[PDB]
Design brief:
The structure is cut from a larger assembly and holds one copy of chain A (65 residues), four copies of chain B, one copy of chain C (218 residues) and two copies of chain E. With 65 residues, chain A is α+β, with helices and mostly antiparallel strands. In chain A, strands 2-1-4-3 form a four-stranded antiparallel β-sheet, with no helix packed on it. In chain A, strand 1 and strand 2 form a beta hairpin. The longest helix of chain A is centred in the last third of the chain and has 11 residues. Chain B is mainly α and 97 residues long. Helix content of chain B is 73%, strand content 6%. Chain B is elongated, with a radius of gyration of 22 Å. With 32 residues, chain E is an all-alpha fold. Chain E contains one helix and no strands. Chain E is rod-shaped and about 40 Å long. The N and C termini of chain E lie far apart (34 Å). The chains are: A alpha+beta (65), B mainly alpha (97), C mainly alpha (218), E mainly alpha (32). Chains in contact: A-C, A-D, B-C, B-D, B-E, B-F, C-D, C-F, C-G, D-F, E-G, E-H. At the B-D interface, strand 1, strand 2 and helix 3 of B face helix 4, helix 5 and strand 3 of D. The structure holds zinc ion. Chain A: Keywords: Antibiotic resistance, Transcription, Transcription regulation. Chain A: GO terms for molecular function: bacterial-type RNA polymerase core enzyme binding.
């Protein structure tokens, strides 16, 4: 088959190759062999807002200052 | 009142004396501190940190073992063991082997 | 008091045998040493801590907005906001530190059923993390009683989870199999589930041993 | 080439060897999919890591027949290849904290204990977070101060 | 000898030690 | 066993993200160590899973 | 030859600073003598009795407030931990041998 | 001597002689060895593979 190639890099300094088909496009970011995300070469606040109107929080922060 | 005093004056000074001896324990532990020594008393370890943390490094877990291995020098221990084998006898020599 | 009857001798015989594992997860002693000592906190101090926590969370929200959309106030005010977020983090840490022994005292009730004491303590600790995330100064409760429900429900969920670290002893499997067989036979012939007295009668053991062995069954 | 299979050597693998063997990091505790019996993405049976269960069958179906070889699908990362690769392709898990290997800690004699001159009881206390060990001391600073 | 008897653990330790040094003497220590 | 190891590792990552105090974090580390030991040689230490 | 402490002997458990005293030594010696075995055999009973007394006191101190004997499983495992720590305790063993 | 052999360890006679001749041809003291008679069971246990 006719083919193509691309490459990706990760912030640790490692680089990886990926063959593709000729009729294939290229993603911009890729989960590499390393397992990291590489580049082509319920949180507490969610819980607090649920039980608050932010004007209460604005007053709460204003008191701190 | 005399009996109450014989309890009070005794126990009040005794607790302070025990604390004063605990300070000597802390200093004597610091002066002989060396790598690979275990410290199990959390009070003693915390006091050692609070006083002299910048002079040493303690840790637990497999990460502490990794740091010990990094600091390890194979040749020195191997040659020390060889020196021991041709000098000691019995269980000491056997353990060295 | 002083007693050295045969039961105490048998207990020490068992203790020496159990002592063959050094860092046993069933022992909380090292964990207790690691907790250290922090005083029990009254309602006013706990609500103060919760107030600081929520203030720090809101400060984090606004600081995150201002870190991106510009509109940054001069550095002198930004420094006070930078102080508020750190204060909130410290308040959360202190409020969690205050209840580790509560987690321990809640966990001690579930021991002997298969999970180690320290694993139950970890589940209770995570229940406590859940508790601090839902606590509310508006409701006005003592944090201990409120977080007790979260700790115990987390412990039950871990216990009632199909995938768990059940670590039954090697020296109990045979007697548990015998217990199962005898209970099955007694159920089939008696017409009803056997009371531990009948089981003890059949197994030639004291009934409280029946009640102890039955805890490992699942 | 079995004609040059002359000796077999064994040794300790380092983290870099484990990372070089592996095709990808297992991220999720998932099994085969309960909903459809397909492998989960990033699970212990992930096809993107360990290869496709069925020959030359792309996960997203953009390549599905024998004539295609070796191509990575740009949309799901699975390689269009023979299924036998699932018997040979290795994975790995990246630990957030170091762990000691049980063979070299447990089992008399204690390899780690003998290497570090640590009694097995003390090493066990250290490893399972029950005691503190002093790792290094700046001896000269203490000596002068 | 009857009044005092023998200490079991000390005898066991002496036995295991004796086996260790005898294995060393025989030159087959690493196999035991 | 692999599932248990992955669970413990992910929860340890989460706890380190949450900024939990060292006691809880390193208790989870102890659990991770035990899970890996069970993965390699289950019965070698103490009582097995 | 079955001596008693002249003054209390600090044991210095890592967390509870236990001690063995005249009353405990006297009572353990009486139990060992009652056992009727030879001296080098009743030594084991003496060691067991002293270990039991020290261990129970130590666990009662560790379990202050939050732990009681009705927590049979937690109590027994805590006792096992303390016994294991005592067994390798050099100072405790040296005192008993004295 | 001047070899890498561990004292007290068992060594194949051929390897022993080979390393001794290597070191003595390189100025080192050859290792000293004592022949040991072994039963077929212990000889089997002492295999090199
Ligand atoms: Zn695809």
């Amino acid at each position: 088959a006719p083919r193509q190639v691309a490459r990706y890099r990760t912030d640790n300094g490692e680089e990886f190759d990926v063959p593709f088909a000729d009729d294939a496009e290229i993603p911009g970011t890729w989960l590499c062999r390393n397992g990291l995300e590489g580049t082509l070469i319920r949180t507490h606040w969610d819980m607090l807002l649920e039980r608050r109107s932010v004007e209460e929080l604005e007053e709460l922060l204003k008191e701190r200052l | 009142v005399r009996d109450s005093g014989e309890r009070e004056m005794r126990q009040l000074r005794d607790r302070a004396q025990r604390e004063l001896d605990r300070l000597d324990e802390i200093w004597n532990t610091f002066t002989k501190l060396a790598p690979k020594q275990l410290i199990v008393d959390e009070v003693l370890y915390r006091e050692l940190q609070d006083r002299y943390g910048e002079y040493f490094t303690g840790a637990m877990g497999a990460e502490s073992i990794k740091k010990l291995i990094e600091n390890f020098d194979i040749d020195a221990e191997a040659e020390s063991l060889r020196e021991v084998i041709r000098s000691g006898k019995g269980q000491k020599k056997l353990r060295a082997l | 008091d002083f007693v050295w009857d045969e039961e105490e001798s048998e207990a020490l015989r068992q203790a020496r045998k159990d002592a063959e594992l050094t860092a046993s997860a069933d022992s909380v002693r090292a964990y207790l040493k690691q907790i250290g000592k922090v005083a029990l906190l009254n309602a006013e101090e706990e609500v103060e801590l919760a107030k600081r926590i929520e203030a720090g969370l809101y400060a984090t929200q606004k600081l995150a907005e201002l870190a991106e959309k510009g509109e940054k106030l001069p550095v002198q005010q930004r420094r006070d906001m930078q102080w508020i977020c750190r204060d909130g983090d410290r308040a959360k840490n202190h409020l969690l530190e205050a209840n580790l022994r509560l987690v321990v005292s809640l966990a001690k009730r579930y021991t002997g059923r298969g999970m180690a004491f320290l694993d139950l303590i970890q589940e209770g600790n995570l229940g406590l993390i859940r508790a601090v995330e839902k606590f509310d100064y508006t409701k006005g409760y003592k944090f201990s009683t409120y977080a007790t429900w979260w700790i115990r429900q987390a412990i039950t969920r871990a216990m009632a989870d199909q995938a768990r670290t059940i670590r039954i002893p090697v020296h109990m499997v045979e007697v548990i199999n015998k217990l199962g067989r005898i209970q099955r036979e007694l159920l089939q012939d008696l017409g009803r589930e056997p009371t531990p007295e009948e089981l003890a009668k059949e197994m030639d053991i004291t009934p409280e041993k029946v009640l102890e062995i039955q805890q490992y069954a699942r | 080439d079995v004609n040059f299979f002359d000796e077999l050597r064994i040794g300790l693998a380092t983290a870099d060897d484990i990372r070089n063997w592996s095709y990808g990091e297992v991220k999720k505790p998932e099994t085969i999919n309960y909903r459809t019996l397909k492998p989960e993405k990033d699970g212990l049976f992930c096809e993107k890591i360990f290869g496709p269960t069925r020959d030359w069958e792309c996960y997203c179906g953009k390549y599905k027949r024998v004539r295609f070889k070796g191509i990575i699908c740009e949309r799901c990362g699975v390689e269009v290849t023979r299924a036998k690769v699932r018997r040979e392709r290795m994975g790995h898990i990246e630990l957030a904290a170091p762990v000691t290997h049980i063979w070299y800690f447990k089992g008399v004699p204690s390899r780690l204990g003998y290497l570090l001159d640590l009694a097995p009881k003390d090493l066990e206390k250290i490893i399972y977070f029950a005691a503190y060990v002093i790792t290094s001391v700046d001896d000269e600073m203490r000596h002068n101060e | 000898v009857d009044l005092l008897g023998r200490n079991k653990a000390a005898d066991e330790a002496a036995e295991r030690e004796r086996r260790e040094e005898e294995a060393y003497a025989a030159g087959v220590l690493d196999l035991m | 066993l692999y599932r248990r190891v992955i669970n413990r590792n992910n929860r340890l990552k989460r706890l380190i993200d949450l900024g939990a105090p060292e006691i809880i974090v390193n208790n989870e580390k102890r659990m991770l160590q035990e899970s890996v030991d069970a993965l390699f040689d289950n019965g070698r230490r103490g009582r097995p899973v | 030859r079955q001596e008693l402490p002249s003054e209390p002997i600090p044991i210095d458990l890592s967390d509870v600073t236990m001690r063995i005293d005249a009353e405990t030594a006297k009572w353990a010696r009486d139990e060992a003598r009652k056992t009727g075995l030879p001296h080098n055999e009743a030594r084991a009973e003496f060691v067991d009795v002293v270990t039991y007394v020290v261990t129970e006191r130590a666990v009662a101190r560790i379990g202050r407030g939050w732990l009681t004997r009705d927590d049979k499983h937690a109590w027994e495992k805590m006792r096992a931990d303390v016994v294991g720590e005592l067994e390798d305790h050099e100072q405790f063993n040296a005192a008993l041998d004295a | 001597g001047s070899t890498e052999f561990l004292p007290g360890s068992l060594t194949e006679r051929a390897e022993f002689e080979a390393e001794n001749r290597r070191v003595v041809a390189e100025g080192g003291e050859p290792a000293a060895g004592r022949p040991v008679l072994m039963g077929i069971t212990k000889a089997s246990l002492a295999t090199d593979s």
